[PDB]
Amino acid sequence: MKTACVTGGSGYIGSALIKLLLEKGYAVKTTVRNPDDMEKNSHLKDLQKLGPLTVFRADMDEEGSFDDAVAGCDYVFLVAAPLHFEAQDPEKEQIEPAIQGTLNTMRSCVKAGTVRRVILTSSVAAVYFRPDLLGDGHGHVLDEDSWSDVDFLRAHKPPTWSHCVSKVLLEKEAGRFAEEHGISLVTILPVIVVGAAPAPKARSSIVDCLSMLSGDEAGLAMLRAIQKTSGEVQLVHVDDLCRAELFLAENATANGRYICSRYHPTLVELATFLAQKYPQYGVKPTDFDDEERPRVTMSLEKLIREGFEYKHNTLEEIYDNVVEYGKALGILPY
Amino acid sequence: MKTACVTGGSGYIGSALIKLLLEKGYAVKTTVRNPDDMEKNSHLKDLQKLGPLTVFRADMDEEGSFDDAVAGCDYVFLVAAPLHFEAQDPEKEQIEPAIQGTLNTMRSCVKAGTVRRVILTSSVAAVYFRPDLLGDGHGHVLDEDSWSDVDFLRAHKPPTWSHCVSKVLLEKEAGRFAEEHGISLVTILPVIVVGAAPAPKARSSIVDCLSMLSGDEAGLAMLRAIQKTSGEVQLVHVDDLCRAELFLAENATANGRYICSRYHPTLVELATFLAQKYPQYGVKPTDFDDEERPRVTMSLEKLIREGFEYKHNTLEEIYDNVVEYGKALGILPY
Ligand SMILES: O=C1C[C@@H](c2ccc(O)cc2)Oc2cc(O)cc(O)c21
Ligand SMILES: O=C1C[C@@H](c2ccc(O)cc2)Oc2cc(O)cc(O)c21
């Protein structure tokens, strides 16, 4: 029986990974910042009903705190924490702590001497910010060779520049570190993630995809900004993301970084689908009518080439269970 | 040096296949119904400059005429192109000749004794007609397991029913014949094909993708019909189709049938692109506004996970050279 560690077990993606690992016969260790907070971590008790699940305390700013959690693990899933709130000095407050915290966990992985592979969950924040491709007014198909432009982001500091710079640098630093220390590191890069997970206090990762239904002003702004940039948005079901992370840990030939994406609708298509299937929220699809814009899209083909198969392939399947989750979280009123 | 036969050398797809094969170092044999008609075959003289190209007279409707062209070949590219003349009895004027013409050439392949693989060019006409799915209000991703409903098509005879039936039945029959004689048959299923080819008298294969520029009422009706059915159209560059045919010929593990597609725009996306890239034609994108419909799309992934790579990936790249071809053919008035 193989053993896996999932960092950030209180979070959206972390909780979904733990569920899949248990269902697949793994013994799981997970880290949280306060194991006694059973309002935040009640799902970890439920999940113990599926297989061996051990909870540990750990924090990214606390050097070595991940030692006991990763020890004995065949695979380690590093789920990066979402930034959450802005900062006066993003370099000192966000970017640098993101690098350091990632290395901190890397070190606990070498020290375990048992980790066959580390799967880093990042996002396409590290892929898409290309001043040439986004700005030249032509369509483009990006892939895993594309990296967000750190120099341009620091020069002009557009909104979310710090989320993108921190993802790029922490991935590069973790790769540099995995090189010098002989540990296999594979990175996955999700688009907007959709679907239910066990975590009771998730939100950040769910606001964008439900914002047409909720009216969340920040969410809608984000979807519109992505569409203004790229001509569309990109979505993937959380269960396919989780299956992809498992796939990448278990298949020895997997190497480097992988975009994880399945459906790329315009907002009017998405709004139209949501209005038809969930009319109780009064979505007006004409609120998202827009000129057709050049499409700048992230290719999904690398994961496909390696033999992975997505299970949520239509728009409706990608949204198959997220609405009931938004209800339970209070993101939606009913 | 391997040798290959390409049927329908005066045709759009046949001529582009010959070009690719010569460039890639094959000796090539091709068939045309009248090797003298230089209206139709002037390109063959030109193509002979690229490598060893030999021309034969043959006719689908004439048993054995393909024997000479196919002899000695390692690969045969069965480009089933010419259909019929919609008469009172499509089952005897179109469907049956299509089947028998295909089996005619397959027999030459058996007689040759040398043929390691036959690549049949069909179309997603043999894939998409799924009345159990086209009106159910949901999206669907169809793949190579989906076949057009021949029974339903014969029962209700919607427009172009016999076209779809011809394609389904000749593919079924050719595969049955191939299995009986232990010959390798692989079928490729293009969507709408875009791009220049050597053939100086092609037309029907290019009218549709040029129809918003030419205003061809038949082409435009076809496009609107596809979009009312599937909520989008699907396009592929002729050069990727030819490279995919060669890929399927050369890759031993290739097996069965393969959708070939790369871009799936709405008509309003396509018209916006064309209007901006080619304003001299007067396209009005609002002529193609339409409500969003559930998407019924053909999966591209079988070819992808077998190792093939498309080179024309954006909408602009798929349209990189067809307008000049259209001007040359007279499809476009200027
Ligand atoms: O920087 C990114 C990545 C980007 C993205 C997603 C999908 C897509 O198709 C293109 C870009 O989305 C985001 C969404 C957020 O709430 C915050 C972010 O920082 C970002
Ligand atoms: O539905 C069809 C049928 C096919 C076709 C063309 C001509 C004809 O006479 C019959 C069928 O062309 C297509 C091309 C597409 O990208 C998507 C489609 O859905 C289709």
Numbering used by the authors:
A (entry chain B), B (entry chain A): 11 to 344
Give the article text.
However, the crystalized SbFNRs did not display any NADP+, thus had to be added for co-crystallization, which indicated that PvDFRa had a higher affinity for NADP+ than SbFNRs, as confirmed by our ITC results. Having both apo- and NADP(H)-bound forms allowed us to observe the conformational change upon binding NADP(H) in the SbFNRs. Compared to the structure without NADP(H), the loop region, 89Val----Pro100 in SbFNR1 (and 89Val----Lys102 in SbFNR2) went through large conformational changes upon binding of NADP(H). Although the activity of SbFNR1 was observed again with both naringenin and erio-dictyol in our assay, a much longer incubation time was required to obtain a detectible amount of the corresponding products, apiforol and luteoforol. Compared to PvDFRa and SbDFR3, SbFNR1 displayed only ~3% product yield.
